[PDB]
Amino acid sequence: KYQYGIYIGRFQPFHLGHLRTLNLALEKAEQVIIILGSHRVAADTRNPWRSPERMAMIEACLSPQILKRVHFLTVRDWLYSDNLWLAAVQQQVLKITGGSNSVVVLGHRKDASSYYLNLFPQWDYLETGHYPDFSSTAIRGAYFEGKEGDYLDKVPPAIADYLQTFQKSERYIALCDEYQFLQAYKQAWATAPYAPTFITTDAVVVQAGHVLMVRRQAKPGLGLIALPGGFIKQNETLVEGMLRELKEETRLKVPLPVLRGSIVDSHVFDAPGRSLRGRTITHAYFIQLPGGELPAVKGGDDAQKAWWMSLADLYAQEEQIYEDHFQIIQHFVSKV
Amino acid sequence: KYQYGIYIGRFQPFHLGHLRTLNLALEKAEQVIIILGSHRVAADTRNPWRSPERMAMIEACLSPQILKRVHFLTVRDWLYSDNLWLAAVQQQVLKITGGSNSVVVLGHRKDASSYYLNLFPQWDYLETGHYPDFSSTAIRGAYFEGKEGDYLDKVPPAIADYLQTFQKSERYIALCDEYQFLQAYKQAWATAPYAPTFITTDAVVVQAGHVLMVRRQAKPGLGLIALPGGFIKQNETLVEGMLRELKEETRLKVPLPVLRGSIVDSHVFDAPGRSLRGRTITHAYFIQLPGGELPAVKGGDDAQKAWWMSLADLYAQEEQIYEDHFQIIQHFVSKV
Amino acid sequence: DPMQTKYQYGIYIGRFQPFHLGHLRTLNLALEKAEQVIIILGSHRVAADTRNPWRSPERMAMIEACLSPQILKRVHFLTVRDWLYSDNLWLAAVQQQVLKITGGSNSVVVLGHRKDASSYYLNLFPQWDYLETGHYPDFSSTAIRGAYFEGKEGDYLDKVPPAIADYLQTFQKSERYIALCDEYQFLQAYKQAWATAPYAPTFITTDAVVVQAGHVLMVRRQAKPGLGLIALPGGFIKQNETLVEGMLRELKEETRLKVPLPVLRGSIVDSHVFDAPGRSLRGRTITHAYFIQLPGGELPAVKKAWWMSLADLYAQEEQIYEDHFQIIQHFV
Amino acid sequence: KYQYGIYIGRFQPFHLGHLRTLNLALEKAEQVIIILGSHRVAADTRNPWRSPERMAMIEACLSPQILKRVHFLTVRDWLYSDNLWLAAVQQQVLKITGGSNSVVVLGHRKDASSYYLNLFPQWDYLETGHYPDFSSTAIRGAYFEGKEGDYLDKVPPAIADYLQTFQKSERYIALCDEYQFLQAYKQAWATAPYAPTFITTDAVVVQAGHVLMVRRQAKPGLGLIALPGGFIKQNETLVEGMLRELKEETRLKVPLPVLRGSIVDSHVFDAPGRSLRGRTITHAYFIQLPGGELPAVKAWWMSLADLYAQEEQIYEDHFQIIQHFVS
Amino acid sequence: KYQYGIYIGRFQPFHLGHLRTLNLALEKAEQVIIILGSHRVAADTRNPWRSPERMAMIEACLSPQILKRVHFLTVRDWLYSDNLWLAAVQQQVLKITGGSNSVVVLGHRKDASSYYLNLFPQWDYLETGHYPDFSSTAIRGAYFEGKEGDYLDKVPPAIADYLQTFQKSERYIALCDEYQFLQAYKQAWATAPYAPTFITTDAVVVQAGHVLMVRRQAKPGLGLIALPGGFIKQNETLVEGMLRELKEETRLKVPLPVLRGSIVDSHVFDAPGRSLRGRTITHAYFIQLPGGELPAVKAWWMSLADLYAQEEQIYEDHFQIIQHFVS
Amino acid sequence: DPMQTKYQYGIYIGRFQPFHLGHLRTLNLALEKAEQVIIILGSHRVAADTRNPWRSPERMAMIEACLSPQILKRVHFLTVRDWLYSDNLWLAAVQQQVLKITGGSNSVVVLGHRKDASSYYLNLFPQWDYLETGHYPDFSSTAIRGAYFEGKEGDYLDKVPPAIADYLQTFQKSERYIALCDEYQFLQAYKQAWATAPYAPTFITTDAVVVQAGHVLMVRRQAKPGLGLIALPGGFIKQNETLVEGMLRELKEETRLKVPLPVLRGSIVDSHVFDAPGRSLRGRTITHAYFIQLPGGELPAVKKAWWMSLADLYAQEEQIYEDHFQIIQHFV
Numbered sequence A, B: 001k002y003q004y005g006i007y008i009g010r011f012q013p014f015h016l017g018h019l020r021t022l023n024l025a026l027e028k029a030e031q032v033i034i035i036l037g038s039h040r041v042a043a044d045t046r047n048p049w050r051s052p053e054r055m056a057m058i059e060a061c062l063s064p065q066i067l068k069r070v071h072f073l074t075v076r077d078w079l080y081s082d083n084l085w086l087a088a089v090q091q092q093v094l095k096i097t098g099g100s101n102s103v104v105v106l107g108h109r110k111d112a113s114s115y116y117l118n119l120f121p122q123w124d125y126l127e128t129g130h131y132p133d134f135s136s137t138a139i140r141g142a143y144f145e146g147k148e149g150d151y152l153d154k155v156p157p158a159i160a161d162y163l164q165t166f167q168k169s170e171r172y173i174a175l176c177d178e179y180q181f182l183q184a185y186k187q188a189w190a191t192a193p194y195a196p197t198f199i200t201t202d203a204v205v206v207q208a209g210h211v212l213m214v215r216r217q218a219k220p221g222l223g224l225i226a227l228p229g230g231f232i233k234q235n236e237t238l239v240e241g242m243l244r245e246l247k248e249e250t251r252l253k254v255p256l257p258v259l260r261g262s263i264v265d266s267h268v269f270d271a272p273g274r275s276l277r278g279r280t281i282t283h284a285y286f287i288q289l290p291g292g293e294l295p296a297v298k299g300g301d302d303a304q305k306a307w308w309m310s311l312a313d314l315y316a317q318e319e320q321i322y323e324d325h326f327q328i329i330q331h332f333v334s335k336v
Numbered sequence C, F: 001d002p003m004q005t006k007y008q009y010g011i012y013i014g015r016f017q018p019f020h021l022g023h024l025r026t027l028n029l030a031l032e033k034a035e036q037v038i039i040i041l042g043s044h045r046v047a048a049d050t051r052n053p054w055r056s057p058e059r060m061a062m063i064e065a066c067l068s069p070q071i072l073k074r075v076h077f078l079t080v081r082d083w084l085y086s087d088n089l090w091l092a093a094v095q096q097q098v099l100k101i102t103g104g105s106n107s108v109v110v111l112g113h114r115k116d117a118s119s120y121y122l123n124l125f126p127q128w129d130y131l132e133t134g135h136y137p138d139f140s141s142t143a144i145r146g147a148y149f150e151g152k153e154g155d156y157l158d159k160v161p162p163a164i165a166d167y168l169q170t171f172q173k174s175e176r177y178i179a180l181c182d183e184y185q186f187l188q189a190y191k192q193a194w195a196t197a198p199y200a201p202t203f204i205t206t207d208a209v210v211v212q213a214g215h216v217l218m219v220r221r222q223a224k225p226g227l228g229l230i231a232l233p234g235g236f237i238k239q240n241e242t243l244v245e246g247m248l249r250e251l252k253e254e255t256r257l258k259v260p261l262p263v264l265r266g267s268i269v270d271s272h273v274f275d276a277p278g279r280s281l282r283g284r285t286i287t288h289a290y291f292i293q294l295p296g297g298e299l300p301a302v303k304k305a306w307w308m309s310l311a312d313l314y315a316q317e318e319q320i321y322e323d324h325f326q327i328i329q330h331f332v
Numbered sequence D, E: 001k002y003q004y005g006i007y008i009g010r011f012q013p014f015h016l017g018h019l020r021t022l023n024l025a026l027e028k029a030e031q032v033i034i035i036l037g038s039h040r041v042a043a044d045t046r047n048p049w050r051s052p053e054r055m056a057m058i059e060a061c062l063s064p065q066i067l068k069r070v071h072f073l074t075v076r077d078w079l080y081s082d083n084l085w086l087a088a089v090q091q092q093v094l095k096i097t098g099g100s101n102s103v104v105v106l107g108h109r110k111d112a113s114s115y116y117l118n119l120f121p122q123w124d125y126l127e128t129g130h131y132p133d134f135s136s137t138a139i140r141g142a143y144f145e146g147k148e149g150d151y152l153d154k155v156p157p158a159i160a161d162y163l164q165t166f167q168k169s170e171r172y173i174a175l176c177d178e179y180q181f182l183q184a185y186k187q188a189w190a191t192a193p194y195a196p197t198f199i200t201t202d203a204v205v206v207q208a209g210h211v212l213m214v215r216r217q218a219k220p221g222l223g224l225i226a227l228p229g230g231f232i233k234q235n236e237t238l239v240e241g242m243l244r245e246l247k248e249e250t251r252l253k254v255p256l257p258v259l260r261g262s263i264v265d266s267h268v269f270d271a272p273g274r275s276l277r278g279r280t281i282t283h284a285y286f287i288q289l290p291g292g293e294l295p296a297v298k299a300w301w302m303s304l305a306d307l308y309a310q311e312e313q314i315y316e317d318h319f320q321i322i323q324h325f326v327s
């Protein structure tokens, strides 16, 4: 009934709801294209598995024979440009679709994040409705809490196998820790009269095509590469707080007045899901340092340190970058 | 010992600590210049009395004879430009000082807000030290709570008289109400694991040299003139929330897409004391509407309404404008 | 419900300087055409001069005195500033003011007469009907103002409502009346002196807009007209100097600003020519205004001249000379 | 006593009063350089003789021995760029000076228009003057009226001879007529309480690298090439004045609204001596029309090349006005 | 049959092949307009005769009856702005056309350089050609070698007569020499696997409204006025090449570092026929020096006015390069 | 504690293509001068070509094979990309890489020899000492690469360490060796054909940088050199076309982009000339790159050509031809 069927998701993990839709797709179209979103996002409690792992997981639920008509595509996130995303999807799809006009998109409008499901009017849209009782969020929560009965009856058996092997790895132990932390963090705000909103700053300091970075020291994202930034204090201005944090986390050897006078731009980042803590809006300041020897910063140990990274280094380690920091850098790179 | 002595304050109200310093000034200099800060700020729980009232209050504590060597100056706030403030102080002072170089500034470095006390190196600075037990904040709190024994023994007798007459007015009843509200508002956050930070948007919509305004409907600032704005919701972007609030408070008859496409600039306002609620940082969006008939907006009743105001109207009613909204408008007026 | 009139609202715009019998005829026509009438007092807060001698509360008192309290229940007075170089701004102000009364009604008519060039605004309200009344001969506020400052009572007493006559007879004893006569005479002599010129004269002046730290350098006028009004430093261009030279010369004469000419020269960020034909009552005066932005810090000393804040300018709007507030507005 | 000596002037005409300084020059320096100012300026009552003609005059007054240690250099006027002029001057100097550092400039500050003798600081300046009094203004005045007695005693015999021959000239008639018109024009303002001040607009209209020009229909500079321009009326804005004047003088086939919309810039030209009628300040508006057919319109479109070739025939300072909007 | 008729060409020289179209023109329209292209272009082996000279030639070939219904119009070249050219063409047309709408343009698209006959769309176009074959390239080739037999049978008797007289000319020697040099230069590249491609830099140095110029020391266009410029060496960047070339040809007294810092702009000039040596693309760098003394340096500073006056003596397309950075 | 060496750290930068006996002599000198030696492998991730035949892990394996494990405890290998038009970027990368080893020490010396124009970088580390070694005759990596691709073993076997000889003898049997010989021969013939030209030839090409929605239009190279590498669409300028025409012509030839020339013409936002003397191995090639920004939406179809994301370009850095990555970087 269609030559091509597209199913997009994160599949973190692939569950019985997803398989139902993936089965429906196999009925409605000859070739099936699975699009693995959030490609190369750093692993966190919302996206635990890398996209090759997610492909293996899905493949393990299907037969070699049905796999003959199944195509995997991975697509990065561009949290601040839907158009860069759309284009990448079109381009990845085209390479399979030849160019055909016989194409459906299967999905369910679950919530606010499902808005993309109608940015393909070019193609047809098959809404599936909700399938009770299959919730990725519930599955992940159960899994990090070690409650097997709340997830085993919700994933394909090949998925349960995978979750059980993966339960042995270092990543799982780190993700359990990070999950306990967030849960406690959110719980500590449970008696607020209103959902809280968090304000942070971030410093984007660039010298001779390099950006000053740190390894995160506090949860969440412990150990990931990040911009130097943090929570605004009650009595400081955004610039002040930005400078205070830059100094605390990098001990950059440049006097505060030249730092101030080197701020050439700033920009607010407010994607509602940028941070799992929390609604967290960050104010990023772009600082351009002049030519010369690379500026000195604390050489603490290695997990304690700060260092300078070129764009090449940045792309090379894309999946080690915290939250949307790669996007913040890319925004100011478009400015220069 | 000096030809001229400068004492700057808000004096809300003038208390025994202030009188001590004002007396010390009268010993140390021939002429005394009192500078009434926060001129033409809308009345709130932090600045209850207008600057002519504050002058009357101070005059009532002094004798006609000593008043012969006392000079009053009023100066506006410019929360985002210390330089505009400094200049205005210099200019107001010069008109009394003739131009003399014999000038001291008396004060006490109480807290972060006292930072201005050393932006006059031109002139000498006499630090007085703290005088125990004389706190404006404590005085105001006591007064709005009606607890006379906590303030009577802290102000000059002429000040106690004034507070007692003023306790009859409509302003006092409104300020009591507003004070109860804030107190309860802050108390409701008392069990937060961290001081909360608030995020709001504000829309600065301009057509044919007019700015769209509202009369505030919620406390605090009930009844004051304000920009249309409000709290960001958890799942909306800043622009989205800005547009949602503009529509809720003005029902402006301009379709959302043309509104979006008319945003020409935005700017963050983060003076830590802009709002008495709360650390509240607002994100203001400047929208330029094209020439033509003045856009329709809700004509509700009068306290329920929205309307268009020229800069002239704005200056004419400066002391009816909420928090720092006049400053936000002035920022974008410097852009055009 | 059957209306007794064609429209809900009638708008009658003017200076009314003073209200004369022509104006009352149109006002009466408006009372026949609309249930409620809106009088718009233009030139609100303009420095009293020979073209605009009465302030808006005086003009409202004058018109009120011609009308019975039953009619006054149907009349609403609104004031609106002039913004000589910005018609869009003015159009919006009129609209916003009218809306306080109108509640948004679309049943609205503007009454007037396209008298001369200054009446162009009558076709800028297409959202409302327009009712041309034709000319009433000859009622002329210019002629009436002339007769009044010249003391020729026979030429205006039969041109104005009896209540206006009374008000005029009373105002005639004020200090403002004397001040106005003095200024009227000066302008009359001034134009006199050019009467034998082969063409109408065109005057060239320069004005200096000097700004540092949100303050504009202003002076009090030492010569007529507008004697004692607040103004920008400026004056007439001499025959052998450039505009910039004239500008700086005149700035030094009037303020004695303690800044070297060479740094004043280098501090000129912009300039603009202001040429509204009626900006000055002395004759056609076209002015060259120069925006000078001083590097921040302590304000330079001057010798009456002073640094005035933007808030203070708005606060003393009505003491400002000619178009000078608009000149400042243009730059800051 | 000096290797090289420089004397700059308009010499309109060359008078005894120059000659004496010229003589004083030949004494103080071995080589003498005479710079003829105002090169290629349209002929008018301030500047009647072309620079070749002025060369001829100053030559006749010299015997060849002398004429053979004197070099003649012409310099254009750029009324609004002194730097450009100083440069053109010192570059033309080098042609002869070769690069010498033993140089003297002679003259004296007579008025305001003699300001050009503080710069140059790289050479030595010897002040003569005042020689009271020979006055070219007075001499051109005398010469144009007919008061022969007032100037024969004032200029060298050879000059007088050339002036004499020139009276027959086709130009002398038109230049006489111009002198009468200006003297009358100025006279008509004598009852004014203050010196009058004239305001004009000029339109600079440019399409496909051509500027719209006209021949002047009215005195002064009648028949010269000019920008469309005129006197502001009492009740029009500068913009509306510029536009009516443009339509009057050229009847340009472009709708008024499109013309308003095509204004990309404007500039005020205010040199005190730009107009001989008295102090006239002009407001120039630069209109820039989209590519394509040249619009219908003596008025005609003229290229930047055309203008340069005919710089001689351009009114007043209209060339500098054009140049200002072009670079 | 038509009121007005237009025929545009370089006519270098006027050949039988033109004449026939000219004849065909006189037949089809009552008035004939001949537009002499390439007006004021320095004389070179593609364009040997000035436009007055070309007028003279085409006149001799006509009897006055005929010569009296033919008008001659000159148009400059602006190699990089066709619009400017089209405009100058149709404006000069109107001088004669008065404003007529019965007009025809004659010729035919021979090659790439004949593209200019699609525009104009406002007139009627009648295609002649091809007339196989008379070839000016071949004729100028013959003429410059000495192969008389190759062109006498190709051009009108009067043309031949003028060419004959011209052989004696001071120019014909230098133009012959140029032809030999180019033919040799091109010949030296015959063993190349592909047509060669030349890269040069030019420096456009500008202070106080003057541009630095030089006389060409090397063939081609020897002795003409040019920008300081040269061939890129194998291991220098364009910037460093431009700068060494600038110092070589002018010995400009300004430190290299200041010169780097004063570069405000650069532009590539790439018209296929700009250089007669073969495909040469030049990279022009615009250096803008601060006001004051003109720096020490045949090289000399030259005003925009000077350049316009001497446009005749300017190499290749160097005038257009200057003009590009000025407006 | 008494040091046995002058410095704590010695830095030796090169391509080492291949490591020969000259390099080993300097390396040995560095081991005498510093306690720890840092070898910087330049040209990391550059597409293998006749100037850079071995990738950095191969070059590290090669140098490792010449050294005893006791010496290797003192040697540290670091890699660094080329950024042909940005020396500041490169200088910073070297500094940052060195700092991983140095801990910030100031006791640091760079050893090398100012051989030719490409050695300019040796004076751009003033924060460190420089030790000029002088020239060793004649060891030449160019000559050794020449002999090796030409199969003349006598000309290089005695120029290189025995371990390098072994590695060379082994690599010689790979498919990459054949590919390199093929390309070497092509370039050699190419230059051959120009040998009788009166001056060194200068080549002119155009390149098109077409971008829509964060994607650059790329091709796979159909002709040598760099056959099968990813590249921008471009080629040689024809004799009678303009650069823009050439650019568009060549863009159409190589990609068959379904966009009309007139809209391609109107979409050129910027252009830049790239002229590093060694950008291309064929001879001096100077290129004109044109930035074309297509209006957003669906990407236009093409016919091998494709739209490549900026992330994918970085991911496939090493498959890119000549300086093309730097050309893209310049614009986006």
Ligand SMILES: NC(=O)c1ccc[n+]([C@@H]2O[C@H](COP(=O)([O-])OP(=O)(O)OC[C@H]3O[C@@H](n4cnc5c(N)ncnc54)[C@H](O)[C@@H]3O)[C@@H](O)[C@H]2O)c1
Binding pocket: A008, A009, A010, A011, A012, A017, A018, A021, A036, A037, A038, A039, A076, A077, A078, A079, A080, A081, A082, A083, A085, A106, A107, A108, A109, A110, A113, A114, A116, A128, A129, A130, A131, A132, A133, A134, A135, A136
């Ligand atoms: N600009 C951008 O970078 C951009 C924009 C939009 C989306 N994205 C990316 O695309 C991906 C979006 O995928 P997702 O997070 O919505 O995928 P998901 O894994 O949550 O769900 C995949 C699909 O299955 C459906 N589904 C899940 N549970 C269901 C249930 N129980 N019943 C019926 N249907 C159910 C979902 O609605 C969805 O259509 C993410 O990677 C996101 O980051 C990127």
